[PDB]
Design a protein around this ligand. Sequence first.
Ligand SMILES: [Mg+2]
Ligand SMILES: [Mg+2]
Ligand SMILES: [Mg+2]
Ligand SMILES: [Mg+2]
Ligand SMILES: [Mg+2]
Ligand SMILES: [Mg+2]
Ligand SMILES: [Mg+2]
Ligand SMILES: [Mg+2]
Ligand SMILES: [Mg+2]
Lengths: 63, 124, 128, 233, 52, 225, 4
Amino acid sequence: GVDIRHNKDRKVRRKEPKSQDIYLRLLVKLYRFLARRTNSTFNQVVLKRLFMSRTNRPPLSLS
Amino acid sequence: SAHLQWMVVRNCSSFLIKRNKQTYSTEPNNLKARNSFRYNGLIHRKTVGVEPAADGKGVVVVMKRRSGQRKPATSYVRTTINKNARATLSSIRHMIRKNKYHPDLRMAAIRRASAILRSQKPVM
Amino acid sequence: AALRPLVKPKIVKKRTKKFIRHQSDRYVKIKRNWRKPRGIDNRVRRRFKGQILMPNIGYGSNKKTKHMLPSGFRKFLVHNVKELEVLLMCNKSYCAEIAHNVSSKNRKAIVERAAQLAIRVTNPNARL
Amino acid sequence: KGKPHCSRNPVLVRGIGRYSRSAMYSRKALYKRKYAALATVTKPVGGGTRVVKLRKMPRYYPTEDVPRKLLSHGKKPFSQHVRKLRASITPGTILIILTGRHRGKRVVFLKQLSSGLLLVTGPLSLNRVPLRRTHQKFVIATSTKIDISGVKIPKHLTDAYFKKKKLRKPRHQEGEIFDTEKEKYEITEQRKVDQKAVDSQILPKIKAVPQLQGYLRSVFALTNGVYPHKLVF
Amino acid sequence: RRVLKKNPLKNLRIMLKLNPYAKTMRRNTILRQARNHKLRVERAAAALAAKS
Amino acid sequence: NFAELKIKRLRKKFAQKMLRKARRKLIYEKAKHYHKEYRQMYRTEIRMARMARKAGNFYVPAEPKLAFVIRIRGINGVSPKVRKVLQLLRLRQIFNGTFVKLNKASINMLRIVEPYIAWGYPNLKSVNELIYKRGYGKINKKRIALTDNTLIARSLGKYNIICMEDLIHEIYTVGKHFKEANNFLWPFKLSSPRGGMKKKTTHFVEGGDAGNREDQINRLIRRMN
Amino acid sequence: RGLR
RNA sequence: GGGCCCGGGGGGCCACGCGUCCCCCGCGAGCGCACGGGGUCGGCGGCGAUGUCGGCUACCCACCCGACCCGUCUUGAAAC
RNA sequence: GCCGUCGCUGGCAGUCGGCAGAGCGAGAAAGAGAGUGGCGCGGACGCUACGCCGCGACGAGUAGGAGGGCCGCUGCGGUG
Ligand SMILES: [Mg+2]
Ligand SMILES: [Mg+2]
Ligand SMILES: [Mg+2]
Ligand SMILES: [Mg+2]
Ligand SMILES: [Mg+2]
Ligand SMILES: [Mg+2]
Ligand SMILES: [Mg+2]
Ligand SMILES: [Mg+2]
Ligand SMILES: [Mg+2]
């Protein structure tokens, strides 16, 4: 046997949004496509933020 | 839209049937009868169906016209092909290719119009 | 005249016997259905030698031949005639099994249809 | 329109040539070899002419098809395989049958057929084993050989000549009516003339060796205290 | 898909897929060896006439 | 048209067929020069000893740069100081093996972990058998079997290591990019010693198995790989 | 070009 | 020994083009064979309808090895 | 060899078809880019993207935690 430790084997990032709405689950489809099919690290950040909970994407003010 | 009402129909339809680790669908114009965005016969703007003719012989083909989209009565056109097993399988092929009408469904339509001829020959 | 499948692969199963429950033999109140033994001093859940075995995930079946009857077909419960057309484009890989409740007057006009459709039925001589 | 030529370098070992790349170039003299740069058919009809199409589209399509398979390179049919033969077996060698109906019977090896099966025939008048095929694995090669080089084995004794022939007599209406069992294998007058011709040339050589005919007529069998690994045959 | 790993030490053409020099490294030490065994059998067949 | 795009695509398919012939020629004339290198480093170690035996003196050969370390104990009952070093040597499993360049900071670790390893000085034939038969590369953090030189060139190319022969030469003759080659090499997984260990729990000088068996590591490699 |  | 074994006067080379300037003195086609990105045979033989073929599971029985009765508190339970 | 978990925050909307041209595994940051002057009507599968596919490494467990159950029980709104 190997003497590794599986304490941190499961990375806890969000693989997908927790919401079940279908106007978000279609945006996440389009942006997961752009994220994997383009070499722009913009789409990857938009996708990774479309996963985030309602407390991690807060509101912006106009000012 | 198509992808919208597919994201609405993918799990809470009434034609959806889920038992024995399989998941088929009983839509009118679903050929291969399996629950998928591609083969669903109600979501898209242009679908294709291949039913058996009402009498003994023949195969009816049901295309969904483009113009009438919210008018279920005058939406589908139907054509009964009571010919040999090969001319009908070159007429469906032309109906789909030469029209460029949902062309990824052609081999499914041929395989279905062959299942009908086979289920309409004299049994043994 | 058997209705052959598409392809008949070799079915290999890592275990054939059932997984009986601990001490389902000394008692009659303990049925054979499996219950993971959670007692402290238990000898089965420590995986001692020569004891009863435990349903690990290692015993899983090959996904290529999982749920596949010895006739090279998977299966489907059929409650009436209309549920065959759902299965008429899966002919050479799935079979039909008319339900237990379908009376013989309907089961006759169900085996008749599946006969025309060349769909194989596992219980075609069921009720009569 | 160049006449084909054999390889210009002998094969020292399989996969390796005797000469190097430059040596091959020089031998081939390539320094002075620099080079630089259906379905339709018209057929008359009784009207006009019809463009008949060959191999028309199939009239049936099964619901499912098996997908194609990957491509291998190292697999060849049995007919094209290379037939091996242990050096212990040579023409005129005495062999012992172990699996056929001629169990423990000594025979005189004739040659090896194209398929690989050893064509052998013990003296029919001595051991009753005519021209027949036998696998080399299932035969023990006795260390007793007789010169058989001067024996013109008929050419038509091929694998096809020795292939089995289905009796094809399950039943029929004629056969059910006037039944004649399931037939038998009637030894062709050809197989008989060939057996006689081969014997006419083999027996004189066998009789030359004293007691050889009696040894052939005898049958090999294990006895008490005899172990195959302890005796040389 | 996963490529089966053959042994570059038992498979001549995988050894030539990884080291095209081993072809001449091996043609040598085979020619050189058949010629050293021919030199030895020449000594040993001049000595059967040197003690005769 | 497309008669232009055809001959263009065939010029691309011919430049990609000549950039490979030039690389097979390069690999070939490289291995042909490593044969000469190894022959020199072998013949001169015999010169430098005959010239000392002619005068009567002694030739002390250079202390070796490369060691091969094998783990000969299990994971059940290891000290923490020995478990940290057996995992900076990437020997997380019995019968694992790795290459190690020697210095003070390395010998002073093979002394801490001495009772758990059996290390020594690998031959060139032993580094050949190892690299060829048990050679796996740590590509993308995946143990990918080394099946073609385009798996070594694709990663170690920037260090002018582009074939299994440049890899063997960099390992045998401890090179500038030794750290990178040894960290590109997934640690070798060897079978059990055919024949069997002498005694696992005592040093090699104690008639056992552990410790350093300088010359005799190859006898164990042949029966373990 | 050398081989022309 | 090293320097392409620096330079002058019988076997192996993944060397073999013409036209110079100059220091050192971008497409040739075919045709096959294969230690080549994981097995194929374009190889076979025997029997098979009232006594035989298959059925791992499921019923009984036989034999070999293993095998202490579960829940529990406990540092520790097969525990007197 | 098979099952599963983890990782690659991996790949696949390109099924781009007589309005066609079927490619992105290859050692080397970036276009099989545009223009500007010297007959036979033919081509498997896929894709419930909550889907499918490919690669490696890994797989003990009381107290405890978490997830997934097309595991099961009874009633309610829909729907077969
Ligand atoms: Mg393990
Ligand atoms: Mg211990
Ligand atoms: Mg042994
Ligand atoms: Mg016992
Ligand atoms: Mg208690
Ligand atoms: Mg106490
Ligand atoms: Mg207890
Ligand atoms: Mg007591
Ligand atoms: Mg576990």
